[PDB]
Amino acid sequence: GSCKGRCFELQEVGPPDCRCDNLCKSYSSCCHDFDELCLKTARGWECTKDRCGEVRNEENACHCSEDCLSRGDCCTNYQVVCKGESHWVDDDCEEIKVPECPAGFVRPPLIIFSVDGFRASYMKKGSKVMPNIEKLRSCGTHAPYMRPVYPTKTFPNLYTLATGLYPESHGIVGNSMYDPVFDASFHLRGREKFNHRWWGGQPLWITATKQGVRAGTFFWSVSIPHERRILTILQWLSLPDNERPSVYAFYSEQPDFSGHKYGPFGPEMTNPLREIDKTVGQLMDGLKQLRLHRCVNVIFVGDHGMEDVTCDRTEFLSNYLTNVDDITLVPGTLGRIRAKSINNSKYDPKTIIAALTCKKPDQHFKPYMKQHLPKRLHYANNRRIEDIHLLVDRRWHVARKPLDFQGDHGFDNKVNSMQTVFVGYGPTFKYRTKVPPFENIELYNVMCDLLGLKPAPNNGTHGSLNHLLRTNTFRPTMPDEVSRPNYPGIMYLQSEFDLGCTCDGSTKERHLLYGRPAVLYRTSYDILYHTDFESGYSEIFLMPLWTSYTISKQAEVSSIPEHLTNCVRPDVRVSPGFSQNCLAYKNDKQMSYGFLFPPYLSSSPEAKYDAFLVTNMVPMYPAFKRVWAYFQRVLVKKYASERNGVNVISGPIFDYNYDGLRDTEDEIKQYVEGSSIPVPTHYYSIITSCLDFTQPADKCDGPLSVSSFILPHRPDNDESCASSEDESKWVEELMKMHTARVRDIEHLTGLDFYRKTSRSYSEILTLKTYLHTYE
Ligand SMILES: *[C@@H]1O[C@H](CO)[C@@H](O[C@@H]2O[C@H](CO)[C@@H](O[C@@H]3O[C@H](CO[C@H]4O[C@H](CO[C@H]5O[C@H](CO)[C@@H](O)[C@H](O)[C@@H]5O)[C@@H](O)[C@H](O[C@H]5O[C@H](CO)[C@@H](O)[C@H](O)[C@@H]5O[C@H]5O[C@H](CO)[C@@H](O)[C@H](O)[C@@H]5O)[C@@H]4O)[C@@H](O)[C@H](O[C@H]4O[C@H](CO)[C@@H](O)[C@H](O)[C@@H]4O)[C@@H]3O)[C@H](O)[C@H]2NC(C)=O)[C@H](O)[C@H]1NC(C)=O
Ligand SMILES: C[C@H](CCCN1CCN(C(=O)OCc2cc(Cl)cc(Cl)c2)CC1)[C@H]1CC[C@H]2[C@@H]3[C@@H](O)C[C@@H]4C[C@H](O)CC[C@]4(C)[C@H]3CC[C@]12C
Ligand SMILES: [Ca+2]
Ligand code: NA
Ligand SMILES: [Zn+2]
Numbered sequence: 001g002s003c004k005g006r007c008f009e010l011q012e013v014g015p016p017d018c019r020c021d022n023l024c025k026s027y028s029s030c031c032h033d034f035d036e037l038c039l040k041t042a043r044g045w046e047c048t049k050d051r052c053g054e055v056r057n058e059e060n061a062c063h064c065s066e067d068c069l070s071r072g073d074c075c076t077n078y079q080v081v082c083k084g085e086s087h088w089v090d091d092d093c094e095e096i097k098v099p100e101c102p103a104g105f106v107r108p109p110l111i112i113f114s115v116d117g118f119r120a121s122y123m124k125k126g127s128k129v130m131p132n133i134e135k136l137r138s139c140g141t142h143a144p145y146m147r148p149v150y151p152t153k154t155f156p157n158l159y160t161l162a163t164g165l166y167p168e169s170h171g172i173v174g175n176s177m178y179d180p181v182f183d184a185s186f187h188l189r190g191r192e193k194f195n196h197r198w199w200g201g202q203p204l205w206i207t208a209t210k211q212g213v214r215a216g217t218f219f220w221s222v223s224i225p226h227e228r229r230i231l232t233i234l235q236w237l238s239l240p241d242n243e244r245p246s247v248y249a250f251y252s253e254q255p256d257f258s259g260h261k262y263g264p265f266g267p268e269m270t271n272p273l274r275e276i277d278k279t280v281g282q283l284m285d286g287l288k289q290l291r292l293h294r295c296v297n298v299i300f301v302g303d304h305g306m307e308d309v310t311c312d313r314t315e316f317l318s319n320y321l322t323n324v325d326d327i328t329l330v331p332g333t334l335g336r337i338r339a340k341s342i343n344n345s346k347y348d349p350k351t352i353i354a355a356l357t358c359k360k361p362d363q364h365f366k367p368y369m370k371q372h373l374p375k376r377l378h379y380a381n382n383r384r385i386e387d388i389h390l391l392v393d394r395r396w397h398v399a400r401k402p403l404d405f406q407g408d409h410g411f412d413n414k415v416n417s418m419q420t421v422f423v424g425y426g427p428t429f430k431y432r433t434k435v436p437p438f439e440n441i442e443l444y445n446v447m448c449d450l451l452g453l454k455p456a457p458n459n460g461t462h463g464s465l466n467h468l469l470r471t472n473t474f475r476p477t478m479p480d481e482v483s484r485p486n487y488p489g490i491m492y493l494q495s496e497f498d499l500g501c502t503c504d505g506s507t508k509e510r511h512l513l514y515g516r517p518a519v520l521y522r523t524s525y526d527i528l529y530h531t532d533f534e535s536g537y538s539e540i541f542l543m544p545l546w547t548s549y550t551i552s553k554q555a556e557v558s559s560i561p562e563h564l565t566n567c568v569r570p571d572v573r574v575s576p577g578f579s580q581n582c583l584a585y586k587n588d589k590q591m592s593y594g595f596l597f598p599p600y601l602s603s604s605p606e607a608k609y610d611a612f613l614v615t616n617m618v619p620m621y622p623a624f625k626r627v628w629a630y631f632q633r634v635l636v637k638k639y640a641s642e643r644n645g646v647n648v649i650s651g652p653i654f655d656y657n658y659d660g661l662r663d664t665e666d667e668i669k670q671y672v673e674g675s676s677i678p679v680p681t682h683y684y685s686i687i688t689s690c691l692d693f694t695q696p697a698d699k700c701d702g703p704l705s706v707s708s709f710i711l712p713h714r715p716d717n718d719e720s721c722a723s724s725e726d727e728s729k730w731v732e733e734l735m736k737m738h739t740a741r742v743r744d745i746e747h748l749t750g751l752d753f754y755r756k757t758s759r760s761y762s763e764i765l766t767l768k769t770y771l772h773t774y775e
């Protein structure tokens with residue numbers, strides 16, 4: 001019945017007994033005197049001159065009595081006003097070469113300071129508006145921005161930070177969602193979100209606790225003001241060695257709420273940012289008070305940005321569909337479409353897609369079946385992600401009908417207005433260090449490193465942010481190759497082939513600039529040398545897993561001759577048994593074919609003939625061949641010209657169950673008619689060159705520059721609303737939208753790239769996680 005001496009205790013009591021923890025308010029189970037004892041407001045949160053060395057009054061919110069320092073319960077400015085200290089902000093950067101902690105502290109603590117709706121460009125306002133944050137940023141380790149996860153909403157991004165996982169893995173696929181096995185819905189407001197069943201993965205505080213590291217309470221009831229959360233953390237830090245937590249979290253609802261009201265560029269934003277900064281300076285002055293301002297790792301992190309969005313920029317689905325009362329839409333900065341009543345019978349997804357596709361000239365959203373969303377969003381492998389999805393343009397809303405704020409967010413995570421912040425400050429972080437942008441999915445690993453914890457399996461690439469840290473507890477180890485390649489010679493005669501096909505050296509060292517890709521699964525496959533390209537031919541999938549080649553700045557683009565239009569040549573080094581045949585392509589009226597190494601970039605007429613081998617051949621829809629041919633004939637040259645040559649590794653992907661991971665044979669669901677030639681769901685390419693663009697690709701001393709994509713292999717170009725125009729109007733726009741990381745392709749292909757470089761392996765991991773966005 002009473003909280004005396006138990007205020008903000010670090011545990012759950014029960015089973016009937018009343019609570020006094022930071023969550024009891026959300027659970028309607030605080031003792032009767034929680035409010036009176038544990039949430040004192042009397043006399044504000046700041047000592048004043050005439051309060052110094054005072055009568056200790058126990059009704060005060062924080063104290064200025066001489067004993068206060070003993071008890072960890074002074075106000076954060078006590079020593080500034082009374083004992084003549086300066087604010088932490090008014091001190092110089094001083095490098096923290098080691099953690100200066102008091103005796104007993106077995107590790108540097110971590111405090112995560114999470115700000116909601118914090119746009120990366122808010123940092124331009126600087127010390128004029130935010131002195132404390134501008135100090136953390138400048139003195140510590142900072143990125144120009146940090147990419148959130150899609151959808152760029154709060155709960156998916158906050159729980160991605162906590163777990164290292166994509167929203168499709170951790171289960172919090174939106175702020176609002178429906179689960180068809182639970183037959184229940186999750187919303188920001190409601191009791192359903194308290195069920196543990198909605199939250200998967202392993203958040204940081206569980207990884208801490210399971211490995212005997214004490215986790216400071218990680219959620220805050222909204223009735224608890226910010227100055228109090230900050231005093232409670234400081235008080236938890238003053239506890240004995242055997243009771244003290246080593247990891248803490250603070251969360252601010254700003255500047256998101258203000259961001260919605262007035263937009264991200266409104267002059268009103270200044271007061272919310274000043275407020276957050278003063279909160280930060282209470283934390284830093286409190287830490288300095290406890291002599292932990294050079295002991296503690298502080299992470300200043302945001303969940304997403306904020307965009308200009310007004311209600312006059314809305315699209316209504318009732319201008320496109322007729323029976324809008326037969327569906328439920330999740331509206332706003334994304335769309336998710338489902339039947340209203342599951343007992344509909346004639347509810348057809350196919351019809352809905354058709355009706356929403358390329359209707360208006362100014363159309364500000366695009367429909368997708370979820371498996372056809374760009375793979376970089378990794379937003380499909382969850383039963384809570386509705387099959388029909390709407391990618392909404394920046395600055396726009398989507399609603400169901402017209403009878404259903406100047407700022408919003410939720411759009412595609414590459415959009416510049418959705419980018420958010422990262423600062424790391426403290427001993428373990430580096431000093432006055434800029435680092436390149438990175439994805440919030442990586443941080444879980446860093447936070448485990450900072451706490452000496454073994455991360456749970458996650459979507460970060462462990463080691464990929466070692467360059468943020470003064471001291472790494474983790475050195476990445478390159479994985480072991482599983483299947484060694486065959487190098488089969490000439491083993492069959494040309495008359496031994498009837499596949500129904502008609503027609504009429506320093507190869508390793510100039511076509512695999514960065515070593516041979518390692519195959520990390522059990523399979524049989526052949527390496528095949530040619531003058532112009534090298535490939536890893538799969539005998540199970542009857543096509544290359546990868547195909548690698550290099551083009552100089554000065555190299556020639558030629559056409560395909562007319563007499564070799566339908567030329568496909570049988571490959572003597574591979575048995576007919578493990579070869580594709582040209583008959584199935586005849587029998588298959590929808591499927592045609594393309595080539596991985598382009599015949600358009602043959603070094604000579606003689607060399608060109610290797611491009612028409614059966615072992616360079618891949619199943620391709622005529623629709624897709626328009627995309628692929630324009631890439632090969634024009635863009636591969638274009639990129640070679642601009643980047644002083646380029647290396648290119650192209651290949652197929654199979655992902656029919658849309659889990660972002662390499663399909664096994666069992667999981668392949670489409671073959672070329674009357675055959676066992678499997679149809680790729682996507683085609684990838686990894687295009688590398690020298691970052692120092694003065695040096696050419698095959699002679700690069702310095703760092704490496706990469707771009708990649710994963711083009712979806714579709715029988716139409718309905719995704720591209722300008723597809724009926726000439727390829728130069730739409731293909732490169734299609735490709736850029738499906739830009740990808742090297743890492744995404746490795747998940748999808750079970751291969752490992754960049755094994756033979758002169759660069760450190762942690763630097764390669766950064767290169768593999770890098771995403772070209774075109775902003
Ligand atoms: C991103 O990283 C993650 C993590 O590395 C990758 O996802 C992981 O993918 C694995 C391979 O597909 C899955 O393995 C399968 O697990 C089945 C059992 O599932 C339950 O246990 C899981 C294990 O959990 C451990 O790890 C977490 C780490 O956070 C800890 O918290 C735990 O303590 C455990 O140590 C658990 O993850 C599963 O959780 C899923 O389901 C529950 C609901 O039941 C949800 O609450 C979760 O959000 C989560 O849902 C996701 O994952 C499932 C698939 O499991 C999808 O269906 C959902 O759509 C959603 O995405 C479960 O509680 C195994 O039985 C299964 O075995 C198969 O394969 C073996 C051989 O290997 C065969 O023998 C079997 O016959 C069988 O077919 C398989 O091992 C992991 O579950 C999954 N983990 C997570 C956290 O998502 C992901 O691919 C990465 N993404 C990319 C792009 O690389
Ligand atoms: C969603 C519920 C609270 C909603 C309001 N909160 C406002 C303050 N807030 C916050 O403090 O954020 C800190 C933070 C920072 C980062 Cl970087 C990352 C994260 Cl994830 C958070 C942000 C929001 C909360 C209240 C109670 C929560 C449940 C727990 O009582 C019990 C469980 C504990 C498990 O570890 C996870 C699952 C579960 C059910 C908790 C889920 C979230 C609940 C319901
Ligand atoms: Ca798969
Ligand atoms: Na055909
Ligand atoms: Zn948010």
Ligand SMILES: [Zn+2]
Nearest residue numbers: 117154256409
């Ligand atoms: Zn918001």
